Design an enzyme around this catalytic site. Sequence first.
Site, mmCIF file in Angstrom:
data_model
loop_
_atom_site.group_PDB
_atom_site.id
_atom_site.type_symbol
_atom_site.label_atom_id
_atom_site.label_comp_id
_atom_site.label_asym_id
_atom_site.label_seq_id
_atom_site.Cartn_x
_atom_site.Cartn_y
_atom_site.Cartn_z
ATOM 1 N N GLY A 212 0.835 -1.179 0.000
ATOM 2 C CA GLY A 212 0.000 0.000 0.000
ATOM 3 C C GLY A 212 0.876 1.237 0.000
ATOM 4 C CD1 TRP A 213 0.877 7.103 -0.065
ATOM 5 C CD2 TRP A 213 1.586 6.506 -2.104
ATOM 6 N NE1 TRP A 213 1.631 8.135 -0.566
ATOM 7 C CE2 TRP A 213 2.078 7.797 -1.814
ATOM 8 C CE3 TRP A 213 1.907 5.920 -3.337
ATOM 9 C CZ2 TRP A 213 2.882 8.513 -2.708
ATOM 10 C CZ3 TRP A 213 2.696 6.633 -4.224
ATOM 11 C CH2 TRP A 213 3.178 7.919 -3.905
ATOM 12 C CD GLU B 52 0.144 1.734 -3.991
ATOM 13 O OE1 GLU B 52 -0.364 2.875 -3.958
ATOM 14 O OE2 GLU B 52 -0.252 0.779 -3.288
ATOM 15 C CE1 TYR C 94 -7.174 3.101 -6.585
ATOM 16 C CE2 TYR C 94 -8.885 1.642 -7.443
ATOM 17 C CZ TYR C 94 -7.746 1.846 -6.672
ATOM 18 O OH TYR C 94 -7.156 0.793 -5.989
#
Lengths: 495, 495
Positions: free
Chosen positions: A94-95, A142, A212
């Site tokens: 995840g970021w 990411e 998105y």
Amino acid sequence: TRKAVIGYYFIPTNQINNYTETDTSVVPFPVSNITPAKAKQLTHINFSFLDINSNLECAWDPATNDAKARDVVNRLTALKAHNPSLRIMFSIGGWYYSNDLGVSHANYVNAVKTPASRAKFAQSCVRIMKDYGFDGVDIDWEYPQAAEVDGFIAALQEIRTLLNQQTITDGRQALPYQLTIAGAGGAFFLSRYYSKLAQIVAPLDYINLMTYDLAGPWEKVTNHQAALFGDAAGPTFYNALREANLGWSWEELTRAFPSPFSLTVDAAVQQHLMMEGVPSAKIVMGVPFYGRAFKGVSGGNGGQYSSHSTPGEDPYPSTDYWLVGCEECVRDKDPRIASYRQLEQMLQGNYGYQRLWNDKTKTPYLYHAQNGLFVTYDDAESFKYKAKYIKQQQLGGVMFWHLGQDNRNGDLLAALDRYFNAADYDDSQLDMGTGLRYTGVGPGNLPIMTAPAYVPGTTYAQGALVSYQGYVWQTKWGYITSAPGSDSAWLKVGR
Amino acid sequence: TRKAVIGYYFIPTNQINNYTETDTSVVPFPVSNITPAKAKQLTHINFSFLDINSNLECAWDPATNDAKARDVVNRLTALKAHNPSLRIMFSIGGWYYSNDLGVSHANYVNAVKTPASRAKFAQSCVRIMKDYGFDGVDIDWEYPQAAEVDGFIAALQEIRTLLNQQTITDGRQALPYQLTIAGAGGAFFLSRYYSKLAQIVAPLDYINLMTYDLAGPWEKVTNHQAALFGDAAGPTFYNALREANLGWSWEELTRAFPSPFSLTVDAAVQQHLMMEGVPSAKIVMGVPFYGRAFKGVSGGNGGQYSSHSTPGEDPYPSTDYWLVGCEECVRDKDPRIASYRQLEQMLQGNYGYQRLWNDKTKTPYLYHAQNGLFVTYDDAESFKYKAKYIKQQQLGGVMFWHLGQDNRNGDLLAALDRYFNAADYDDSQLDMGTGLRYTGVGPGNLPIMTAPAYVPGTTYAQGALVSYQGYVWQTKWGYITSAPGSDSAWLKVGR
Ligand SMILES: Cc1cccn2c(=O)c3cc(C(=O)NCc4cccnc4)c(N)nc3nc12
Ligand SMILES: Cc1cccn2c(=O)c3cc(C(=O)NCc4cccnc4)c(N)nc3nc12
Ligand SMILES: Cc1cccn2c(=O)c3cc(C(=O)NCc4cccnc4)c(N)nc3nc12
């Protein structure tokens, strides 16, 4: 075959440590909200997030209460009783953990460096999966940079090797353990690893495109964060892929990567299909279950494509909570993002929001004419077009972030299940509109073409078409005496 | 240090077999026309042409009388009495033998293909040199294709090894054996091997750019065959170097290879200097001692940039000799080529030709209004601008095709020698004009720049400039968290 429906279940460490299914102020979205019907509509739940620690192993947040975590996972895996196809994946990264400046980024870079590091990391992923009852591994780094990509490849291949092993060992051939990643949905981050998509995707069951956040308060012009197709009235963007380390000629890069371009869901998908060896059945389209909101917007185009005064800092700087009707924003201390659940309640709560529709992008948006606000979001209508897209392009299915942001009845999830599977739904007449399509052509989407075989010793003029070693080639200038492939003068234009 | 002055002595097999110095109808230009004065003005003579036989060895044309051949070469090497710096090179190849469609082309392909073939071919070169008394090896393969280039280079390297050994074995430290090639002077052919220019030129003393034949009857519009700089009113060409096998990014290809562009001598020189590792002192500027004639040209600009009715195939496919006053055109059955010698007599002979000058390209041309004729050629005037360019660009010197086309006074040779070495010639205020320069920027000609040092951990905005690992770098888009050289976001712009 059944299209994938992959919904993230995100729960922070504090909510795990204080897990309860009876107090929405502590846990806003308990697993109990995932009913049997909803469990039948999912094919995968991405439990998130685990991490990579400084020991370069897959790990829970060190603050995690291990018993409370197992109990949350168990509640998720119990759902498989209602759906034999259902898998509870777990997501690493995840970021916040894994972006370049994230708290754990170095552990991602260093875990993939050596065969020994990769074998240690990969074994820790399978050990974790087995210890908690997960059905697969999802990696959301990411994002790996150019020089890290091969190590990242090898790390995936190593996980693939151990997962297939464990499948035989546990006799799970009917529901084999799976490996997926979250992939960039826009060209800028995709450019880091684009040239190696084929080898990135080969050990995956799916690459879930994060299609998105293609707009936000960090850009100076309001836009749709997940337009399917482009709107010539909307802003356009630098095509970062034309700078990726592909080694292509100028004509090859130019015809694959028109610039500027409309940063759309369809752009990201076609960009993956442009590479040889990337099967459409492995591409999963991400969709957002939240909207992004802007302040200071000018009327005229309903807030679309307008200047704005929305801060881009994280965390949100002030306490100006200006998204009128967004109680959930107050809880989370940010007026720039709102769940679909919450936006639905704003629309039916008489707050001055008008729901509009862009028939190029095939997405909804809210304009607050009085307060000058604009919200880009997705709903069941826009999911109609994206579903038909998924079917037309033979993609693997849909992914969304995240389950907690649907409304209490799960209408967005039910819509996705319906568009793929319901006998009472018919999209055969659904008109995909005339929004801008991404027309880049690359090695992976060359058309079949027909041309005379190449005759050695012939002098070809400019534009001549010739068939040779499995491709159709076109000359870029005149007096061509060289053979195709061997020379700067021939362009591969067909198969 | 003295600029090279490299003149081609071309003599066909039948002129050798019938060699005489007392009949210009058998041999138009015997070696006796090279007087001691002209020998002093030359630094190299490229004897031409030898070949590669089917045994993949350097060889004379099988039809050559070897006794007659030895005598012609001994006459050329006797010239060294008048000039201790003078080198009698020999040339392997030329268009006729070595072009894609030429009679010996496959022998060039096969000679360089393997270690044993290259060793055998390199040895044959040095054996030929020593056996006939030549001072070095010049290779005019026109031109190796991309797949052949690595083998070509290895062969050039292998020749360099043997020649350097041969220098020591022969006591020739004061006049070492040399290795040159004739390289393309235009982008189209150049794009075959452009990406490997560095390793091609590394074993060479000189690369002799064939910066002529850049116009000709195979092109639909009349043009100057050896324009120094471009004329905005003239035709422009596709820049084939943007399709060379460079592996650069779109931005890098774009700024290096503007297209379309002016096919000029300056373009070719700058194109060589754009590549890293290509030293200017090895670059030699070819110039033509002949002119190219066109028929069917219209007025309005002295015959420049006009359509025309000149046949372009070779041999000249008719017996219509329309270049009026061109005696040797009739002798040679081709009105499309006239030596400077013949052209000068046409200008002296009252035949209706006007000599005109293009002050942008810095080259002369003839216009024949009555008969609609156009001739592009070079003279002692255009040689002033080119010699000044050679000095200002710090190139190695000049090459020309060919000695037998100079006038009987040797004015063209003498002019070149004057502009380089006459103590009483001053070109300090020679106006180089406002013709178009080649603007392309590549890795070997980056501007020197300064910029704050790159700081890891920083997030850079678009257009930011940093210094890193010897270069200045610019971000092509925003929110850059990676380092220059590790990301597609960083463009090398300087230092
Ligand atoms: C500051 C910033 C700059 C560029 C990209 N940025 C992101 O791309 C991003 C992404 C997220 C995020 O969480 N996206 C949801 C998601 C779902 C499933 C897997 N991974 C991520 C976030 N919170 N901040 C983000 N900030 C940035
Ligand atoms: C048909 C044609 C099309 C485009 C270019 N063309 C040439 O550029 C060319 C060049 C030569 C030639 O011989 N130039 C002399 C020379 C000097 C030094 C070393 N090697 C050769 C020739 N005969 N035909 C040539 N035809 C063509
Ligand atoms: C995908 C995403 C999710 C959440 C936050 N996100 C950002 O906050 C963000 C910020 C930028 C950005 O450009 N921020 C300031 C800036 C502007 C110009 C030059 N340098 C820095 C960007 N490009 N993408 C961004 N994506 C995200």
